[PDB]
Every structure is written in C-alpha cells, then in structure tokens.
Amino acid sequence: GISRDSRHKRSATGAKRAQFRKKRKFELGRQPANTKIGAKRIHSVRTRGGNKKYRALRIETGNFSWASEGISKKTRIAGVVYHPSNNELVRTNTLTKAAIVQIDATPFRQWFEAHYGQTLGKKSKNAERKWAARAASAKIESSVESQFSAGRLYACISSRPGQSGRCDGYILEGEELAFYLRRLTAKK
Amino acid sequence: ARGPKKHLKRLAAPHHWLLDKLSGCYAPRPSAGPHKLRESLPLIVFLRNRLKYALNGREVKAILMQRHVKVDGKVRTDTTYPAGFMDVITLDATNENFRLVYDVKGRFAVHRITDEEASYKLGKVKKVQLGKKGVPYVVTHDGRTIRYPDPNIKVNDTVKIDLASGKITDFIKFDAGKLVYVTGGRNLGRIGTIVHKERHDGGFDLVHIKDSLDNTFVTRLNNVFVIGEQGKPYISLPKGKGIKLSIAEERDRRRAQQGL
C-alpha cells in the first residue's frame, strides 16, 4: 500500500532510481485519521510488534492543561479556529496536533472560583482561609479572562489524535496566545 | 530474511569451538541466552567435543534430560544453551565443577574448579541504571539484573555473584594496576594488569595491559574484564595464566617436555 521508503524517490543528483525489490511491510504507512468532532469513535490499529495504535475518528472532549494554574480538566471541544498547516483543517473542523481550538472555559471557571473566590469575568472557614492563603495569585491575564465571558478558551492540541485517540492540549497564554490572536483568532 | 535464523552452517560457527570441517553441514546454533552467540559455548559442544562424555547429540540430550548438567546452579536441559565466559558448569555425577575461561589461544578451556570456587562467579558490570520506583540496578556481562547495587559500583567494574542468591558479595573497581582478563579480539585469553586507560571521548576507550613478563598490548575496553588485584585473582586461572608464549618458545617447551 502506502510505501514510506526512499527507493521510489529520485536521487539527490536527480537520477531516476530503478526498482530494487517489492514493497515491504516494515516500511508501510496508513491512511490519515482525519479526526472530526463529535460522537466518540475510536478504532484500534494493529502495528508492528502488536503495539496497538488508536485512531481517533470524530471524538468529542479532551484533557486540557492550564499551565499557569498547573491543573488539567476534561473539557468539550467547540471548533477549530486556526491551523498552521492547512486552512482546510480549520474549515472541516479536523483535529490534529497543533490545531488551535476553543473548548469550554466551564470546568476551568468552576475550578478557579472554587480555588480563589474571584468570579472570572464579571462558604466555609476552611475555604476562606485557603482563599486568603492563595490571595495575590488570582490575577491571571486580561487576554485570558476576556475569553471567560464568552465561555470559550483558546487552546492548542498537543496530542496526536490519529496516533493515540486523544485530543489533549493546553490553554494558550502569553506570547503564544498573542501570536494566534493577532494572526487569525480575532476578527470573529 | 522475514524473521530470525534458526540454523548455523558449519564454516559459519565460531572458530574457537574447534569443530571439524567435514562430518556435518551444520553446527549447534546457540539458543538465546545469557551470552552472545559468537562468545558462547553451547552445552553440546562442551559435553561432546570438549569433555568427550557424549559421542553425539543424542547422548548429549540423554545426559541433559536426566538433569546432570547445571550452569550457574540451574539444570539447563537445553542442548544449545549458550554458556559463556565465567559460567560455572556442575556435573553432580563425577562430582565435577568447571568454569568457562578462555585459554591463551582464545578458546574455552576445560578448567576444573573446586566446590567453593563453583559457589560463585564474576560479572562485568555492563550498565548501572535506575529502574522503576527509582530502584538502582546493575547489569552484568551475562545478562544478570542485580537490584540495589553498591553505589560505588560503576561500569567496567567487576562483581562477585553468590550464584545461589543472585547477590553481589564484593566488587573490584577498574583502575590501573588491577588484574584483568582479555575477553575478545586478537589478545583473547591474555592476562595482565592495567597500566593505564586512555579515554577517547566519543568512541572506544583503550586499555594498556602488561603481563607477568612485561609484554604490553593495547585492547579496547569492551574486551577487558577485571578479575582481581595485583596478582591473587578472585578466580582460579587456567594453565598458562594468559602469558602468550611465542611460537618459537612454545616449540621449545614442546620439545622439552616431550623428551622428558
């Protein structure tokens, strides 16, 4: 099938290499997952040495990390808004690695309000003492808190769904967030 | 191709097995095991070709299936079991104990040891690493994984293994002046003391070794196996002690002790 070797290519001098042997299984490649959004569907792959791979086909949610807060939450993925490799992946809402998406802001806001008592956007003694000890830490960033009003945080996929069956990622902060904001994720 | 090879053609076996050219298309292909294929000695080669206790493979299998032989204290009914350097071979019948040490011609010698020597072996530390749960362990030259090693133990050192319990009794560092045994290359079987060790960062540390008669040679570190301090090895050396006589003096003693 798909052959992943270099014999079919031209040589560095441009010469047309002749056929050396038949295609081998140990040099194969598979069809892309083209992971979509919705109604989780994962097919296993038998790979070399056993070693199951998990093809993500149209899965719903994922695990996303707030690195400044050092927490990770299961969160639904809304859509793809940017992709550095192909704008058609944005168009078709295809989930690969490095695709910029919006997710929920919702479990992250409950965690933040339970951890600081601040109400991002606009009762116990133990809770109060914990919040006081965590004070001088609630101010995160205007460009992140702005997203919480719309209930959609910008996050980058750090997992390969077509290899692992997971849409994991991290919220954008700082210069990475500003880069994608200036680039395309503004302008609605 | 397409998978692992199961046959070893005669003329492709290790030369130090001293198998005859004719009388067979094949050679015993050593099983997977503690020692590498080229550096091993299959039990059939030891029992048949070296010790002459068996006339053919069928007798080797007959001996092994009654659980007479044992390598490092375990029966090893396998005919092609890859016994190698510093393996202890015990025959409960004949009350015989052997350690596999090369003679000075780069071949495994039929070397006899006592019960107290057969109680232990030596292993060259191939690697030192932290395993899961952060538990340190050493790996020896015979594939033994030994957990909780002494922290002073590094790579190229030698450990004494209890061989009843897989435990280190003591160890020897790799330093100049320590007795070593050459386990590879063209100087295989020679014994001497480390003069010094030149690093060559990025590849192939070298070791300078001189024997009893001040003959020096240089060998790659991979072939160097520490076996004791200055003199007094921790193992019983075979006859010759790795001196490497020249052919002229070899011939001189041939004609000396052949004419009484």
């Binding site: 560095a12 690195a67 550095p84 700082g174 990475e176 | 990025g202």
Partner: protein, 155 residues
Amino acid sequence: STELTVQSERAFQKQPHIFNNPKVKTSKRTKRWYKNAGLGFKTPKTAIEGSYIDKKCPFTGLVSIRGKILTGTVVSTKMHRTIVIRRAYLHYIPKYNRYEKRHKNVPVHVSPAFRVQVGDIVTVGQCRPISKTVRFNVVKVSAAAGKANKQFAKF
C-alpha cells in the same frame, strides 16, 4: 537571533516543553533552553543569548551529535539553514602507485547561531536524518580573517 522575524511562519515558534510562566515576572521574559553538544565543542554565545528556535540546532534543538566528525569547505549557502560543503580527498589507484583528486558534496544543516560564507572551512558532526540528504550539523566554523582586509578602496 533577537530580531529579524523569529515568528515568521503560520505556527508559533518555540522550544518544546520549555514553559514561560505569565505570572512570575523574572527580569528576562524568556527561558531559553540550551545544551553543550559535547566532544569539546563550545556552545556559541549566539545560541545562548539568541532568540531563534531551530529544532535542528545541536545546541538549542532536539538533535544530538554522534558518529563522524568531518571537515569541509562551504561551497553553497543558498538554502535556508542548510549549506553544502566540498570534501576533497586523494584516491589511491594501486596499479599506477598514484592518486587522483576526488571530492564529495555533503549537505549540512547550519544553525542560525553560525554565520557561514562560501569558502569557510567548517567542522560538521553527524546527527540523525534531518532531511532527505542532510545527516550533519555545523559544530564549528573557521573563518577568522578571510584575507579581505586589503581589498578595499584606497584614497
């Protein structure tokens, strides 16, 4: 590479798994990972205090140097972050007891920590396959003077 469009591509360029915390404002705003490739090769200050990314850099990238260390002459700096060096050698033909001049062209990745011009003698170190043809990174340059100090306009 503090300037000249580090972020010049559709994806944000960064060193993987190196985290700049937006909260704790240490007076540099940039955590730059680096390593010493080893074998006595000094890490350039341009790599240390730069801002380029170059995942294929042997000092700031993921690649590692292991294998052959070769020297050559830069014959082409036209590709982006890749040079071609010319390795000349004498090949001995036994029948005539004589040699013939022979050369090889090696494509080498060059880190933006290094400035190389056609004619510079370069030390390159083997790494894993970077490209179809590239199997080396520049680890050293030897352009000291260039013999261009007395080839200018004279009053």
